[PDB]
Design a protein around this ligand. Structure first.
Ligand SMILES: c1ccc2c(c1)[nH]c1cncnc12
Length: 254
């Protein structure tokens, strides 16, 4: 097939993924370069939905200049019927990589943790708190993790495994800290902290319950265990901040 974003023509390669009203494609431009085009249908979209979309685009377009750990938005075409976004194409999303891969390299993990802190820190410096961080929000692009979205735009998906206790109780940057710790905990232990609880009502009860001790099995990396223990502190007031995580021995020491 084929498609037009501004003047430029794009040959479709495959469908990289989906959404409700959205479809993502792997494409080639006239210079035979690879990109991702996110198509969004605005046909049955309300004003609040439209505005949530316009807000997330404006933020992504802006924050691109601030960090390379944020996905590139090269161009876009917005009408009253559709949105076309020409973005950088990834190799695989972090969830699909983690699900496929057996064990993760301690260096690979440390490197990915670093990238995650850098992307989230950036959004936070611009007043953005994602609140729905999951491995699916990150993209491997040449051994580099990139943040896919900001959580602003309406609508794995629906998962409560990375949900902070305060979000269940009903939201500060500390909420994203909890969710990041759940991601690192998965990369460390091969499961999210409350993954063994099937029942969603029982799972939500465990997360909020302080008498429910989160287990941190002894790994050779004492620095990595401390990060996990720091991130996964139920009281947001007792939880480590992102600027504090960037100065932690796990990130800084050889
Ligand atoms: C936006 C831009 C690029 C991608 C995306 C969403 N999902 C993906 C999944 N796998 C690879 N690349 C991408």
């Amino acid at each position: 097939q084929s498609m037009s974003v501004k003047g430029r023509i794009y040959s479709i390669l495959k469908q990289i993924g989906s959404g409700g009203s959205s479809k993502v494609f792997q494409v080639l431009n006239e210079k035979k370069q690879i990109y991702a085009i996110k198509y969004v249908n605005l046909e049955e979209a309300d004003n609040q939905t439209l505005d949530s979309y316009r807000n997330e685009i404006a933020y992504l377009n802006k924050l691109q200049q601030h960090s390379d750990k944020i996905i590139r938005l090269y161009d876009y075409e917005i009408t009253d019927q559709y949105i076309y976004m020409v973005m950088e194409c990834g190799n695989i999303d972090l969830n699909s990589w983690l699900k496929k891969k057996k064990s993760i390299d301690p260096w690979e993990r440390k490197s990915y943790w670093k990238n995650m802190l850098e992307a989230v820190h950036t959004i936070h410096q611009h007043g953005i708190v994602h609140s729905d961080l999951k491995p699916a929000n990150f993209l491997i692009v040449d051994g580099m993790l990139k943040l896919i979205d900001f959580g602003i735009a309406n609508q794995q998906v629906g998962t409560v495994n990375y949900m902070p206790p305060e979000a269940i109780k009903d939201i500060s940057p500390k909420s994203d800290v909890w969710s990041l710790g759940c991601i690192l905990y998965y990369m460390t232990y091969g499961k999210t902290p409350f993954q063994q609880i099937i029942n969603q009502i029982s799972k939500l009860h465990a997360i909020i319950d302080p008498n429910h001790e989160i287990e941190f099995p002894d790994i050779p990396e004492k620095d990595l265990q401390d990060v996990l223990k720091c991130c996964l502190k139920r009281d947001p007031k007792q939880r480590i901040s992102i600027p504090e995580l960037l100065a932690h021995p796990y990130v800084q020491i050889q």
